Amino acid sequence: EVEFDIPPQALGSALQEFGRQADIQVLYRPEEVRNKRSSAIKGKLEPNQAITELLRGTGASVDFQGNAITISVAEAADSSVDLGATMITSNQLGTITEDSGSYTPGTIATATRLVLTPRETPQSITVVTRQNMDDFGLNNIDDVMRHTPGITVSAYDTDRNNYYARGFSINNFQYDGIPSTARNVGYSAGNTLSDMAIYDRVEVLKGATGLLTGAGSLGATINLIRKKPTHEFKGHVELGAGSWDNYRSELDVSGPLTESGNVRGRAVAAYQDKHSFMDHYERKTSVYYGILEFDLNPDTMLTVGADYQDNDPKGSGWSGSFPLFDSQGNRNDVSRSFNNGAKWSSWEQYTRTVFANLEHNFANGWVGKVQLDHKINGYHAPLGAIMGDWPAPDNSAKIVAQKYTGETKSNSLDIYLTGPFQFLGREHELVVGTSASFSHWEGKSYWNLRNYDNTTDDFINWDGDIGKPDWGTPSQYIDDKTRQLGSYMTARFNVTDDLNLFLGGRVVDYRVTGLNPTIRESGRFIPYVGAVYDLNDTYSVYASYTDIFMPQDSWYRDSSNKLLEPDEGQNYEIGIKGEYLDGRLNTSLAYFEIHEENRAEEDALYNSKPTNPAITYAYKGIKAKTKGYEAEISGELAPGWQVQAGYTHKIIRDDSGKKVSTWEPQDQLSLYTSYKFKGALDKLTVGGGARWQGKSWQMVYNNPRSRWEKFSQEDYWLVDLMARYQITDKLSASVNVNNVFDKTYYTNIGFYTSASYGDPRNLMFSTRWDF
Amino acid sequence: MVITHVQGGGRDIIQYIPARSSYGTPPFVPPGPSPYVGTGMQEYRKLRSTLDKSHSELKKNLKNETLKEVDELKSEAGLPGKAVSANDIRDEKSIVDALMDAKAKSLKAIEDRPANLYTASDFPQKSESMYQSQLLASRKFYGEFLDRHMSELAKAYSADIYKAQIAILKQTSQELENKARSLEAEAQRAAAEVE
């Protein structure tokens, strides 16, 4: 029951104002509300009474679908059925997943910046909703990714994780639809450690995502949707304790800050201090987030926000957790508690964002948005760990220590327009936008240590006890300035009642200046072709042609010292999507092929006998091809029964025919279900899940035995259990059991001739108090 | 292991011996910072000094070293160390010439190799900078690079020595004919006086 103040006006304006005031996504067709007016509403009425009062005399009907509503004007005659009708939306980011109760989303704008339902999206879109995160205790993005169908989380060391989709490493992140500067695979800056306390959902769009990303990787884009201020007061305190001294605390507060409700705010603060199943390891994390929304008038809204996150570990590992082989070339046998990192070893990662947004509703149903962001993504990594073919026969080992310190400051500006347009008596939608980004990366690297004794007598009983070195002076410097300029346009034509065509593209300008030679790339086109055909009320078939490129490094040049053409690829997709129970349940089945061009490969022939003095180590561009399929189900199976399940099959082979990205399994399966009891057991929720993955391998070089070996991980199952009890209206307690059957497995399969183990069986106990 | 071959041999005067490898080409190299740079640079500085101080120790005393090679071959052939006889001077010259030619062949084998960064004359000057660039660019293990740079510098330093040894043998060979010419001149003079 909220306070509503909307005067009699054009119906479409009233619906956009109601959407803001009720904190609800309002969908309506622009042609249907065209010459109609709203009736006046003022006072503290429930949202249901409010819309029935607002619509009085319009002849419109409402479809209540959780955190969204669809307005329709029914007519005396049979109305022609057009499921994909162009619709005006109140929330440009999609439907809010918080308090929905579902594992499936509503609308999402993550593909083409148009607010579409998953069925309307001619692409592979997977979303991890707020309830899924609450239910399975997914505190960070790594936990989220481990629970995301078609994602493989592979680790380098304790604080360096990498995500794989469709044979490619995902290097793309977006925050509220605004893309973050393309992450360096090794120089963790903080994206892979994003705490979930400040977000509503995570949207993972798979394939070739260039249209809204610009320059980036293949496989997917991870869009994180921040939590937002509300028109009614709501908040919570949540404390948690789990295996290996893992303590967590979270506070979230949201509501109006003035009597009229013109000013609204949300502030969230979280703290986690944990130890590990791994020796001499501890990490401290702090998140702070604050956002203010101002209504300048009923059509204009200004937003100012900021967020902070610091990740501070001690005892950070480096290459893996242990060496694969001993000095003699025999395979090592270490316990899951083994940690190679010295006590003082740390890969410290931090992030801060300061954003301001301006949103306007124009008289023609069009809405304009302006987004200004200032981001920081740094790291302070004085690393040190047992590294190399160790132990030696006298159970001796050697420590390798290097320090990396870097920071990336980014200033981005993003203006875009979205609205309906008529053409040959039919309603279509268009997106036109421009973007500009200015990024600066400074970094120092220390590897010439002063007078350091890097030997340890005991390897088996390694405690992490070695002194810290005098790092000396920087051995290498990075000072890179990047300027990326974009322009996009996407049209969604409502061709017939059963056919909707997507045509769009992006033009990219990219320039990098620094200590190395200037990289200049102008007029880089990224196409977008999509279509959706309604078979019937439930099913729709789709097909898409999408693309993306990544400007290569100044290090990736050919023999003629000319830089390699950008690493790029096309996603060719055919599929079928289902929609049941008024969109409360969604199913999909798709076939994909990723065509890659300019995959940098070492030029062995040149590199063995280099002839040009300008280039000492050159590269060669090759082609690669992923072929696969994916099936997915999410949402209500029954009235209180929910699911998020998926199956993915993938093979990536290069130009020669050889399989590549072999550590990512060809087959993977995920299922996460929960059931809320009815009647007397109403306060009890029970849940569970299981994740299976096929055989994964990697070729490793055995230096002591001068031979290549195949390091494999056989297929394995991981089972999670869950339960929650609502003790009081305000207080609830939960328990979460992960790796229920305590399986031993690997997260790192031979990277840096080292391995890492996945978490042993662990539990998390949490209690939550809602105000 | 760097071995200095003082005695004449088919193998280069300064030899670098390395362990065999099957890791020359790796299908995939992990993106991000290389952990081998620090230790790679440390291993380079260790080997480079032992190879440089082996070259300069030899240039210092190359006159005695090469005349000692000549003296081993001289005695290995039954000739005495000090040569006065006409038969002995002529026999001794051939050894000097045979040694000179062997060194000439060895020097020509190094010099007549296809041109690349490794074979450049300025390579010793450019080796440390080039090596570090290769470690930074490849992000892979130093082993193959280090073995190549040292084997290529063993040859560079062997070519410097061989070039100088030929100069020593040309002067030794010239002096030999002078003794021979004057010796036969004096045998002639004396034979005419005995008549």
Q: Do B116 and A186 make contact, defined as CB atoms within 8 angstroms?
A: no
Query: Which amino acid is residue A152, in one-letter code?
Result: T
Q: How many CA atoms lie within 13 A of A767 on its CB side?
A: 4
| DSSP labels, B126-157 | HHHHHHHHHHHHH-S-THHHHHHHHHHHHHHH
Q: Which of A261, A188, A189, A210 is nearest to A17 (CA)?
A: A261
CA nearest to A659 within chain B: B27
Q: Which of A220, A88, A125 is nearest to A530 (CA)?
A: A125
- Name the segment(s) of chain A with CATH classification 2.40.170.20: 229-771
Q: Which residues pair with A456 in a beta bridge?
A: A397
The beta-carbon neighbor of B33 closest among A186, A613, A706 is A186
Which of B123, B127, B138 is the best substitution to test chain A (most A C-beta atoms within 10 A)? B138
Task: Specify the number of domains making up chain B.
Answer: 1
Q: Would you say how long chain B is, in residues?
A: 195
For residue A410, the SS3 value is: strand
Q: Return the structure tokens found at B106.
A: 């060895």
Tell me the chain B residues in contact with residue A708 when contact means C-beta distances shorter than 8 Å: 22-23
DSSP designation for A612: -
Burial class for A457, CB neighbours closer than 10 Å (0-12, 13-18, 19+): exposed
CB A481 within 8 A of CB A510: no
The beta-carbon neighbor of B35 closest among A400, A660, A707 is A400
Cα(A143)–Cα(A195) distance, rounded to whole angstroms? 10
Helix (H) or strand (E) holding B107: helix B86-111
CB A415 within 8 A of CB A369: yes
Which of B20, B22, B128 is the best substitution to test chain A (most A C-beta atoms within 10 A)? B22
Query: Which amino acid is residue A334, in one-letter code?
Result: V
Q: Return the structure tokens found at A412.
A: 């981005």
Q: Do A186 and B28 make contact, defined as CB atoms within 8 angstroms?
A: no
CB atoms within 10 A of CB A268: 23
Query: Which amino acid is residue A635, in one-letter code?
Result: G
Is B21 touching A (CB cutoff 8 A)?
yes
- Name the segment(s) of chain A with CATH classification 2.170.130.10: 85-228
Q: Which of A475, A340, A487, A364 is nearest to A88 (CA)?
A: A364
Q: Do A448 and B38 make contact, defined as CB atoms within 8 angstroms?
A: yes
Q: Report helix angle B123-138 to B143-193, nearest 10.
A: 160
The beta-carbon neighbor of A708 closest among B22, B37, B118 is B22
Tell me the chain B residues in contact with residue A319 when contact means C-beta distances shorter than 8 Å: 35
Q: Which residue has the tokens 């997917």?
A: A220
CATH 2.40.170.20 assigned to domain A229-771? The reply is yes
CB A692 within 8 A of CB A715: yes
Cα(A635)–Cα(A657) distance, rounded to whole angstroms? 40
Characterize the bridge pairing of strands A397-422 and A455-456: antiparallel
Which of A340, A383, A617 is the best substitution to test chain B (most B C-beta atoms within 10 A)? A617
Which of B21, B23, B128, B135 is the best substitution to test chain A (most A C-beta atoms within 10 A)? B23
Helix (H) or strand (E) holding A17: helix A11-21
Q: Which residue has the tokens 């990224």?
A: A526
CB A252 within 8 A of CB A236: yes
Cα(A203)–Cα(A222) distance, rounded to whole angstroms? 6
Q: Which of A380, A359, A301, A605 is nearest to B114 (CA)?
A: A605
For residue B185, the SS3 value is: helix
Cα(A66)–Cα(A68) distance, rounded to whole angstroms? 5
For residue B108, the SS3 value is: helix
Q: Which residues pair with A300 in a beta bridge?
A: A360
Spell out the residues 6+ positions from residue B58 whose beta carbon is closer than 8 angstroms to its own: B4, B13, B14, B65, B161
DSSP designation for A6: E
Q: Which residue has the tokens 């290995």?
A: B76
Cα(A260)–Cα(A6) distance, rounded to whole angstroms? 12
Is B122 touching A (CB cutoff 8 A)?
no
Which of A192, A319, A447 is the best substitution to test chain B (most B C-beta atoms within 10 A)? A447
DSSP H helix total and E strand total for chain A? 6, 43
Q: Return the structure tokens found at A261.
A: 């409700």
Cα(A262)–Cα(A260) distance, rounded to whole angstroms? 5
CA nearest to A445 within chain B: B33
Cα(B43)–Cα(B34) distance, rounded to whole angstroms? 15
Q: Do B143 and A703 make contact, defined as CB atoms within 8 angstroms?
A: yes
For residue B39, the SS3 value is: helix
CB atoms within 10 A of CB A236: 16
Q: Return the structure tokens found at A107.
A: 């609308």
User: For A521-527, which contacts have Cβ atoms below 8 Å and span 24 or more sequence positions?
Assistant: A521/A551, A521/A566, A524/A215, A524/A549, A524/A566, A526/A210, A526/A211, A526/A214
The beta-carbon neighbor of A617 closest among B32, B33, B137 is B137
Q: Do A751 and B33 make contact, defined as CB atoms within 8 angstroms?
A: no
Cα(A470)–Cα(A516) distance, rounded to whole angstroms? 28
Percentages helix, strand, coil for chain A (3-state, rounded to 5) are 10, 55, 35
Is B117 touching A (CB cutoff 8 A)?
yes
Helix (H) or strand (E) holding B181: helix B143-193
Torsion of CA B172, B177, B178, B179, to 10 degrees: 90
Tell me the chain A residues in contact with residue B28 when contact means C-beta distances shorter than 8 Å: 660-661
Characterize the bridge pairing of strands A348-361 and A199-207: unpaired
Q: Would you say how long chain A is, in residues?
A: 771
CB B67 within 8 A of CB B22: no
**What is the maximal distance between C-alpha atoms in chain A?**
91
Q: Return the structure tokens found at A224.
A: 């994180």
Sign of CA dihedral A518, A484, A564, B26: positive
Q: Return the structure tokens found at A615.
A: 């280039």
Torsion of CA A129, A135, A136, A137, to 10 degrees: 90
Q: Return the structure tokens found at B71.
A: 């003296």
CB A124 within 8 A of CB A592: yes
CA distances from B19 to A215, B23, B143, B148 (A): 43, 11, 9, 11
Sign of CA dihedral A212, A215, A218, A221: negative
Shortest Cα distance from B25 to chain A (angstroms)? 7
Spell out the residues 6+ positions from residue A710 whose beta carbon is closer than 8 angstroms to its own: A697, A698, A699, A700
Q: Which of residues 162-181 of B touch A (CB under 8 A)?
A: none
Helix (H) or strand (E) holding A414: strand A397-422
Identify whether A323 is preceded by a cis peptide bond (ω within 30 of 0).
no
| CA A648 to the chain's CA centroid | 18
Q: Return the structure tokens found at A89.
A: 């939306």
Q: Which of A97, A92, A151, A106 is nearest to A129 (CA)?
A: A97
CB A659 within 8 A of CB A653: yes
The beta-carbon neighbor of A447 closest among B22, B38, B115 is B38
Q: Return the structure tokens found at A491.
A: 């049209």
Characterize the bridge pairing of strands A25-28 and A68-72: parallel
The beta-carbon neighbor of A184 closest among B25, B32, B137 is B32
According to the 3-state scheme, what is the secondary structure of B40-93? HHHHHHHHHHHHHHHHHHHHHCHHHHHHHHHHHHHHHCCCCCCCCCHHHHHHHH
Q: Which residues pair with A404 in a beta bridge?
A: A381, A445
Q: What is the resolution of this structure in A?
A: 2.8
Q: Return the structure tokens found at A394.
A: 């006298």
CB atoms within 10 A of CB B82: 8
Q: Output Rg (C-alpha) for chain B, integer angstroms.
A: 23
Q: Which residue has the tokens 């005995």?
A: B194
Tell me the chain B residues in contact with residue A170 when contact means C-beta distances shorter than 8 Å: none
Domain A85-228 homologous superfamily, CATH: TonB-dependent receptor, plug domain (2.170.130.10)
Torsion of CA B68, B71, B72, B76, to 10 degrees: 180
Q: Which of B79, B83, B73 is nearest to B103 (CA)?
A: B73
Query: Which amino acid is residue A423, in one-letter code?
Result: F
Helix (H) or strand (E) holding A309: strand A300-314
CB A600 within 8 A of CB A130: no
Q: Return the structure tokens found at B156.
A: 């560079």
Cα(B88)–Cα(B81) distance, rounded to whole angstroms? 10
The beta-carbon neighbor of A699 closest among B27, B37, B141 is B27
Any alpha helices (H) in A632-734, and if so which ranges? Answer: none
Q: Which residue has the tokens 């899951």?
A: A336
Tell me the chain B residues in contact with residue A160 when contact means C-beta distances shorter than 8 Å: 32
Cα(A754)–Cα(A748) distance, rounded to whole angstroms? 8
CB A218 within 8 A of CB A166: yes
Is B118 touching A (CB cutoff 8 A)?
yes
> What is the arrangement of strands in the sheet containing A160-165, beginning at the earlier edge strand?
A152-157, A160-165, A168-169
Q: Do B137 and A387 make contact, defined as CB atoms within 8 angstroms?
A: no
Q: What angle do CA A404, A407, A409 make, to 5 degrees?
A: 170
CB A186 within 8 A of CB A93: no
Q: Which residues pair with A435 in a beta bridge?
A: A414, A486
CB B33 within 8 A of CB B137: no
Q: Which residues pair with A251 in a beta bridge?
A: A237, A269
Beta strand ranges found along A227-262 (DSSP E): 234-242, 246-256
Q: Which residue has the tokens 């069986």?
A: A761
Query: Which amino acid is residue A750, in one-letter code?
Result: G
Q: Which of A423, A429, A475, A424 is nearest to A448 (CA)?
A: A475
CB B58 within 8 A of CB B4: yes
Both ends of chain A: CA-CA distance in Å?
A: 16
CB A212 within 8 A of CB A488: yes
Burial class for B14, CB neighbours closer than 10 Å (0-12, 13-18, 19+): buried
CB A433 within 8 A of CB A418: no
Task: Note down the domain range covering B8.
Answer: 1-195
Cα(A120)–Cα(A141) distance, rounded to whole angstroms? 27
Cα(A676)–Cα(A685) distance, rounded to whole angstroms? 4
Q: Which of B154, B127, B168 is nearest to B5 (CA)?
A: B154
Q: Which of A757, A666, A755 is nearest to A718 (CA)?
A: A757
